[PDB]
Each structure stands twice: as structure tokens, then as C-alpha cells.
Amino acid sequence: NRPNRLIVDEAINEDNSVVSLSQPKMDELQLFRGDTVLLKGKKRREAVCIVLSDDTCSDEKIRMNRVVRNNLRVRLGDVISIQPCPDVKYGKRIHVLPIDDTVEGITGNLFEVYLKPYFLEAYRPIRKGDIFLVRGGMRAVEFKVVETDPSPYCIVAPDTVIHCEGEPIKREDEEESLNEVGYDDIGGCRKQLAQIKEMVELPLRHPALFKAIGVKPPRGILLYGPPGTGKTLIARAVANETGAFFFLINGPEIMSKLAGESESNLRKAFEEAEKNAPAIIFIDELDAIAPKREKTHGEVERRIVSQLLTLMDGLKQRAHVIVMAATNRPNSIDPALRRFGRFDREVDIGIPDATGRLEILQIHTKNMKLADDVDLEQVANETHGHVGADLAALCSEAALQAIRKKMDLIDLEDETIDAEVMNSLAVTMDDFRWALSQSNPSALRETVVEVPQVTWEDIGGLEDVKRELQELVQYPVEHPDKFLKFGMTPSKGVLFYGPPGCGKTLLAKAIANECQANFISIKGPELLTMWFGESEANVREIFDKARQAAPCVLFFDELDSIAKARGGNIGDGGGAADRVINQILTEMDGMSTKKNVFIIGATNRPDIIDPAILRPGRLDQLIYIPLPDEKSRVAILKANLRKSPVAKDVDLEFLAKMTNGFSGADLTEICQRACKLAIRESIESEIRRERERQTNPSAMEVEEDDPVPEIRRDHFEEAMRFARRSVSDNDIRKYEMFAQTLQQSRGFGSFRF
């Protein structure tokens, strides 16, 4: 975004040999094909190379050394104010760094031969930190000094042979240095983190501007409180991106086996960092002395807090450094730092977003090539339930799945490193899908576990209800903007009814199984702490975990059997249940995002319903009490048979006719009874055949040893005769109560104007 920023594309060579400086580049700047150019490179990449001006072949935009820029992590398009670097002059005997990786492949004293070829007419870019084509001893002898403050290259007489370092530099250190934590990994918080970084940088890059503002510059910046995503990543990326001696703090450093040694040491470290330079204060474990010793009885902790405040306050507190408020929990933190001056500044908070997660997912994927035909960004957007910071774990899972696939498809095969196994982990969404099936959000995983179930499509009935639930899930997922465009908001919650849990719990389980996003179920048992004053705390913690779990589906047990706040009595369970209902309504009301809101509860007793929950905002969709209709009974029977070996001798039409509105659980029980009868018959036949002779062909066909491989119509009739009904006059009364609740909340008439 600067005039000194031409459009630097990759040069015709990955080195600086075929650079194409534009005619405008060669004109506005003294950009010769063979002139030393002090260009700009990222992560402190001092470029003093001689980039060619191949505007004759094509007077296109700037062409930059691809390999050199990649090794120097340079920005192809940055404002490379490429000026002459004749001022930087090298010494006659400088500490030239002979790399062991450079000699790892070079034959003999090829270092001396290359130096002779490099001392005069080096025929390569004159810089440091980039990828320069250096050939010697039939190998890449990049035995160059990492950098020299004056003239990183030979800017002295060609015969000024710098005294090469005796030790050979191993490739492991070079790899570790190259894999630095750049500001690229600092994405996502491109608003808050960007603002904080700009505040820090302007103070460092234009402190005169801050002084000339007339107002004093900010004395510091307290960092955002990250919710466990790992703020060390941001801190390390900033410290690498920053030229300040960021004194790293540590919780262990706060421990002193002596008297006041930790506080004195911390003060000494702060003083040393300040006197050192306009350094930084990498305040790690920022949530250690959190409460400002308000309720804390620890005098040593109190003394530490006092020393910390004295460092953060008092005379000359505003040094040329600032600390990072990497808060694990801001509620633990106390106001003794929350003031701009009580700490570096007023701190922000950090949290993950799924839309930006694809960008974070993009970075994680770009870290290591692992797929070609995989729409990884598309799937990652399709998987918005990802925990965000767990995107690294998800990538590791995809890598592990691909590694298992390849390493099982072959032997160890270390020598025959397959190109598919060498270049990437996969080339398609096979590994990604394996991970996604395997992967799940770690926070909820530690919070809760689950049992498997069949899909919502794998179960039948309530097609309108299932379609409505799916549409409700998809609407925010698919076109939340359309609802914003409609100028309306999504619905909060639903209520489920029917028979007395005749698969209603099963229906909820199947819906959760088919659920695209996260779905947390609840049971009434995890409610009350024996120690009083904590059960309501447990409810609050559960609600907070749910809120942090957004977008997730909030499922629970039958609320009529869980919390009958206006269903049990006006007076609740010793105030504990009252506070639980108050939090739930406060979960149902107040002011919150509620990205994915759901409500699962069976009409065990419609009178056990709490009216506060019954209202909208607490429950939108009503618990429609269905029963197995004759057609519905036939559908349920067909669905149950679908997973079973049924026989044509059994007539589902006669089964439905005999059903006369029997429970689906009753049908399942009848199926189980018939299966048990058939299994007993088969076992008895096998035993009889075995006992027929000491040498007899016992049960030559087990499915034929069963009355049929499929079920026996005789067994079905026997089970039916051994079965009872499910419709009750008490069930009639419960249905009547539900119908009274409905018709009471039902207005007679079409209401069409």
C-alpha cells in the first residue's frame, strides 16, 4: 500500500539471477540490473542483493527471487525501498559461518574452493538469510555467515577473506530458526490483536508521532484474556515480530525458597529489561496472582502482589516496555491491574470464531501440504462446530488418519518414501473426512461423552417434525443473513411429546446423531451438590459451558421429570431448585448471543411443566403429544423390520390391523420376543442334532436350523398371543390433559383477514 511497493512477482529464476525490474522501477528508483539494492524483507530480512532488471524481456511488474524471498520470508510486493548499500562495508576477517549442512554433501575442502569462487565475483546475491544458489564440490555450499551487521555480504575488497568459523553449523538449528513464529500465525483477531500490535508498533515505529499528538503516548497495553486457546502462540509471534527484549515471565519464577527472593528477582528483571532497551515484558502465567490478594490469606502471595503493583505503579512506572495480560480467567483477575496504570493498560479478551477459523484452518493447512483435491476450506466451513484452537488437533487427526492409511497400505517403507506419502498426507478429503468422523470438540469431550445412535433418517415417523427440526438447524447454518434480511431472529427452543418416552428419548438420540453441529444432552441427575451453595453453582457452570459451546444443541431429559418449577410447586427445592430455574430462565432470558439454542424435554406430565419455561423465549415449539396411528404403526413396524431378517410369511398389513394403536415399544418388544423364540428353537435344534449321535452332522444349516433364516410367522403369532396392549384409560386421561393444554393454547378459526 505504498508507492515504494511495486508489484513484486516471482522472478524468472527462484534466485536473484533473472529478476525483472520494471522500466518504471528502473526509472523512479535507481534500479539497475547489476546494482546493490537495499530492499525490504519481512522478519528482519536485510536484502542487499543485485536484482536484475529484465524489463527488456518483459517490462512487467517487479519480479522477485522466489527461493531467496521464501528463505528470507520476504513479501513479494512489499515496499522494497531498494537503495544502494555501499555504506555497509565488510571487514577483512569476519566470522564467516561455515554451515555443516552446507558441507553435508560437499566433497573435500570445497569450502576453500567455493570461497575462492565467492571471494572475487561471487556471482550470487550479496545478502544474508535468503536462498542464494551456491554451488561448490558438486553440492549446495551455503556456508555463509547468518548475517553481518555491517555488510552481511562481501562489501570489502574481493581478497578480504573473512575468517571462516571453525565449527560447522548443523542443519537442525537452521531448520529451527527458519520455522519461526511469524505474524502470519497471528490471524483471526485481525481487529483486537491488530489494534494492540499497531499500538505497540507505532509506539516503537513512530513514538515521535505519539509525542507530537499533544497527548502523552499510552504507557503500555495489557493483553487480551484468551480462553485457553493458547496465548503463547500470539505472544511468541509478536516477540518474533518485535525487536524488543521480551523478558519472559514464568509461574515458577514467582516461587522463592528464600525470603522475598522471587519479588526481588522480578523487580531486578524488570529493571534489567528497562535499562537494557525499549524491551518488552512477556508476562506469562498472567492468571497466577489473580485476585489482588482480596480474599487471599497468603502473605507471601500478598507480598508478591504488592511488589507487582509497585512495579506497575509509582515513579517511572511508564518505562519503554509493557507487559502482556494473557489472562486465563478475567474473573479471577482483580481491578488492581484493570486500570490503565494499574497494569500496562485496560486488557481485551480473546476468543475463537468459526468464520475466521477457515482462515486459521487455511494457515494450518498451508503449514504442511496434505491434500490436493480436498475442499478443505469448504469442509472446514461446513464443520463450524470446530473448537477453533482445536483446528491444529483436527489437522493432526487428518494427518494421523492418512499416515495410518499409507503405513498400513504398505510396510514401514522408510527407504521407498512414496511420493504420495512424501509430498503430502493425502490429496483428497479421505483423511479429512476420517478425521472429522474421529474428531470432535475437545472442550465438550472433556465435559461430556456420548453413546452411539442411528440417524434421524434411519428412524421413521414425524416427518413434518423432523423436517422442521432440520430446517431450524439449517436456517442459521445456511442463510442466517436471510433471517437478518427478513429482519427477524431465530427461534430459541422446542418441546417434545408423544407417548411416555416410547422412543421419544430414542427420537432425541437419533436427532442428535443426525445433527450436523454440536449437541449436548443433559440428565436431571447431575443437578444437586450435597454441599449446599454449590448445586446452583453447578447449574451456572453447566449453563456457562453451554454458552461457550455455542453453536451447540442444548438437549436435556424430560424437564417435566427434571425441573418442575411451576410443575412441582410454587415453592421450589429449598431455594436451590428455585435458583436453578432462575438461572435457566436467565439462560432463557437476559442478553446473550445464543448461537445454537435447543430444548429437549419429554411430556412425562404436561402439568409438571414450569410455566416460565412454557413461555416463548424459554420454549418456542410445543411438546406435541403423538401416538402410533395405524399408518404410523405400520411405518414404525416397517422401520423396525428394516434392520431385521424378516420373512414374507409375516404380513405387515395384518400386523397394522391388529395394532389398533399399540405402542412402538410394544412392537419392538413383540419383535424381540419372536426373535427370542426363534433363537431358542435354533439352539434346541442344534443341541438335539448334536446329541442325536456322537458322530452326527449337527445343524448343517443354522438359519435352516432356525424355523427360517428370517422370522417365523408362527413365531410372530405366538408372540402376538403372548403380548398385551399399550393404550390405557390413564393414557387416555394424559392425552386428554395434553389436548386441554393444546386447545387452551389453540385459537379456533383460520384467522384470515
Next chain:
Amino acid sequence: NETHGHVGADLAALCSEAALQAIRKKMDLIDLEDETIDAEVMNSLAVTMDDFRWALSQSNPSALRETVVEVPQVTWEDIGGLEDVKRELQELVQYPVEHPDKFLKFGMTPSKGVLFYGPPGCGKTLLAKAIANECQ
């Protein structure tokens, strides 16, 4: 196959207990043997399915060991009548041993349990104890 209740370190402790029971029997079946400790006799002791079964009956799962404490239970032979009920209980027990086959054939899960709505106060604890003794 019988030891379907205990597992892991419980199974290892059960094996140690079976060895201890067999050794105690053999040493009791012999004298102190402090003068001629026949290593052939010790090897022949080995382990008896009798000794192993005696320990296994003596043994129990560690979780139940802190949970329940059984009392004597008469066998289903001592149980009188309820022939259909006994058959149903036996079928339920056998369901554990071959239910893989049943699920493979039909694909139907078994029932959990039955409410023994017996005669009022006729004594169902007798039935429960008989089942527990017959329980595997």
C-alpha cells in the same frame, strides 16, 4: 469363558488366588515337606480345575467386593415350581452366551428385566436367591 465377571488386575489376582488355593491344598494334602520338598510334587500340583473353581467361587469382582456381600443361596433345583419362569430365566441367561448369534440372525436386542409381580408377600426373595445361586 466362565470368568466373564472379573477382568484385568482382578483377573490376575484371581489367578494368584487359584494358585494359592492349589498350593494350600497340596501342602495340606502333604506334610510340611520341609525335608523332602519334591519339586516333582510341586509341579504335579500345577493347578486343578477343582482348585481353580474353588478359588473362582471364593473370588469375586473387586468393584462388587466393595459393593455387595452375598449370603447363601439355594440352587434352582431347590426352587419349586415356576417352570415357565425358570425357563424364561434360563433363556435370559443363555442370551448372554449366544446373543451375538441371535443379533446376527435377526438383529433384535434382548429385554432388560421383568417385574416379578408375585403374590403379595408370598416371598419373592426366595426366587431372587434361587436366581442368584443359578446366576452365572
